[PDB]
Design a protein around this ligand. Sequence first.
Ligand SMILES: CCOP(=O)(Cc1ccc(C)cc1)OCC
Ligand SMILES: CCOP(=O)(Cc1ccc(C)cc1)OCC
Ligand SMILES: [Co+2]
Ligand SMILES: [Co+2]
Ligand SMILES: [Co+2]
Ligand SMILES: [Co+2]
Ligand code: NA
Ligand code: NA
Lengths: 336, 336
Amino acid sequence: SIGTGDRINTVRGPITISEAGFTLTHEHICGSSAGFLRAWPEFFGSRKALAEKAVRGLRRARAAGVRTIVDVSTFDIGRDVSLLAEVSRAADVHIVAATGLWFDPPLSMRLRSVEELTQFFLREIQYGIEDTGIRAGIIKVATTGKATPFQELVLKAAARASLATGVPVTTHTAASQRDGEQQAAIFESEGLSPSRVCIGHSDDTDDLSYLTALAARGYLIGLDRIPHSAIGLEDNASASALLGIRSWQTRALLIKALIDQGYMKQILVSNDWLFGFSSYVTNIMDVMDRVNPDGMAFIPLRVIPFLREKGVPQETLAGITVTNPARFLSPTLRAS
Amino acid sequence: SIGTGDRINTVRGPITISEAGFTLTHEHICGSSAGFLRAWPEFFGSRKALAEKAVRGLRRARAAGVRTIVDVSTFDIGRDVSLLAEVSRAADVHIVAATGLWFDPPLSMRLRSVEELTQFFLREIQYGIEDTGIRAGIIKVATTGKATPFQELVLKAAARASLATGVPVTTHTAASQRDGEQQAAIFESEGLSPSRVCIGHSDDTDDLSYLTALAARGYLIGLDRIPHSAIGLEDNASASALLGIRSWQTRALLIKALIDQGYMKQILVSNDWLFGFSSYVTNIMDVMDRVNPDGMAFIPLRVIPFLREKGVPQETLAGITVTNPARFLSPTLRAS
Ligand SMILES: CCOP(=O)(Cc1ccc(C)cc1)OCC
Ligand SMILES: CCOP(=O)(Cc1ccc(C)cc1)OCC
Ligand SMILES: [Co+2]
Ligand SMILES: [Co+2]
Ligand SMILES: [Co+2]
Ligand SMILES: [Co+2]
Ligand code: NA
Ligand code: NA
C-alpha cells in the first residue's frame, strides 16, 4: 500500500502524523441535524454558549493529554465545520472533520445514486466542506441493523471515496445485531482493505466472538462508547434506551479482552461525547452530563487508569491511544 | 381583526401592502433540503449558476408584471434566505420568506414538542431566519393524507404562531385526499381564523364540491400548480408521478369555476415553480423546464389570458393576483 502525503486533514489545516498524538477517534462537538444549529441556535442556549461549553470541554480533555479528536459528525448530524474550526483554535485541540452520511439523510441525499454520493464524499475530502477549504479526514457511515437499500449505497460510496483518497472509513453499528459483518462484506466487495475501516460502537455488545472475528480479518474495532450508561436512571425511558444498562467498566473490559486475545493493534477507543445534542429528546445533554461530568476526558481520566489497574501494560495503552489512531488516520492507498 | 403595522416582511425588509402588487403566492427559488445547497452547490452546477438562473427567471416574470413572489421554502425545503436576498436584489423582485415545516423535518425537528415548534416559528417570524434579521412573512405546513402525529404538532404550532404574529399560514395538501378539511379542523381548534389560511395545491383536485365548501368557510384556495403536467411524458414515470396527467387548462379552469361559484375573493394563484430541485430524481428540473419554459411567468403569460378569453373579466383577475394576495399577506390579528 502507499501514502498520499503523510499528512492528516484537520479543521485548522494539515498536520503531520506525529502531531496527532493522543487521539479520541469518535467524538462530536455537537450532535444535531443539517442546518439546525444555524437555524435555531437558541436550542443550545446560543451558538456562543455552545462554543464556550465546547472549548471548556476540549481544554479539560487536552489537560488530560488529548491532543486530537475525530468529530465524526456527518452532514446530517449537522456538522458545522466553522464551529469546529473556531473551537479547535480556541481550545488548541486538533479536530479531524468527517464526510459520509449517518441515519438522518434528507431527501436531497436519500434519492442520490452511489456515483452521485461518491462525488459528494470526494468533494468534502478533496475540495473541502462547503466553501471553507476545510477537508474531511475521515468518512462516517452507519446502519442500525440490516442495511437498507440507501445505506448500502452509502457504504459503497464510502468505500470508493476511501479507495480513491486513502482517508479511512468509520462506522456506527447496532453492535448487538452484529452489523459489522454485513458492513465488512460490502466494503470488501468494493475492494476496500479492512485496515481502512473501524467498526464503531463495538462496545455496545459483549460478544467477543463477534469482535475477535472482525479484528482477525484486519478491521479496527471501535470501543467508543465507554462512558455511556443509564445505570441508576432506570426511571428515565429515553436515557435508558440511548445509553443502555451496561456499566462503563463492563464496556472498558472489552478493551482488555481484545488485548488479551492478541488484537491490541486493532483497538481504537473513545467516548462518543458531545457538547450539544438536538437529535434526541430535549435535555438529553443535561442527563448525559450528569452521567459523565468528565465528558471527553473520561477515557484518559477513568478508562486508561482502570485498564492499567486490571493489568494492561502502560506501553500497550499508549499503542492504543496514539499509535493505532495515527496508522488509521494516515491517508493510505491500496497497493496498485 | 387587527393589523400589526400593515407591512409585509420580504427578504429586503418591510414593504407597504401596496408595494406587493402582482404577487405569486406559492413559489420556490430552489426546492432542496436543509444545508444541501451550501454543502453540495455543484449539484446545481454552482451556487452562482443557480443564482443567475433565478435572476433570469425572476426578471422574465417581472417583465410580465410580477412584482412579488412568496417563496414557501421552509427550513426543510433547504431555504437559503441569503440566496433569496441576493436574487431579490439582482432581479428587483420582492420575495417573502417562509417559516414552518414541510415533510422532510430532520430528527432535531421531528422530536420537538408543539411548544418548542411554536418558538422556532415565532423566531423566524419575529427575530428572523438564522442570523440574517430577514423575517418570515408566511408559515408553511403540509400533510399528504391524514396528518401524522408530528404533522398535527406542526399544524397547531403554525396556528399559534399565526395568532400571535398575524402572519398567514399556507399549506401543501394531497388535495385529492381532501386534506384541507382536516387542516381546517385542526386550525379552527386552535382558534385560527380561516381568512389567515390558504389550503394549497387545491388545483391538484377536480372535486369542486370539496373546494367550494372550504371557500365557503372563509379559507383561501391556492390553485398554485397550474403549469404542472406530464402530458406527453407518459414514458417518464418519475415525472408523471410528480406532475400528473391533467392539463394546465384543466387546472386553470378551476380558477374560473371558483369565480363562478362566487368566490373570486378566496382564490390565490401560483406556479409552484423553482430554478433548482434536488429533493427529487436527478435532472427533474430539466424535465420541468421543458414542460414550462415560461417558468414563473406562466401565470401572467398563459393563464391570465386564457381566463380572459374564457370570459373572466380583467378586473376580476386583477382582484385575484393583486387584492387577494395583499389581504392575505397583511399580518392580521384576531379582534381583541
Ligand atoms: C507516550 C507518552 O504519552 P504521551 O506522548 C501521550 C499520552 C498522554 C496521556 C495518556 C493517558 C496517553 C498518551 O504524553 C503526553 C505528552
Ligand atoms: C390594475 C392592475 O395592473 P397592475 O398594477 C398589475 C398587474 C400587471 C399584469 C397582470 C397580468 C395583472 C396585474 O399593472 C402593472 C403596472
Ligand atoms: Co453513532
Ligand atoms: Co457518535
Ligand atoms: Co408542496
Ligand atoms: Co411548493
Ligand atoms: Na484530502
Ligand atoms: Na414579523
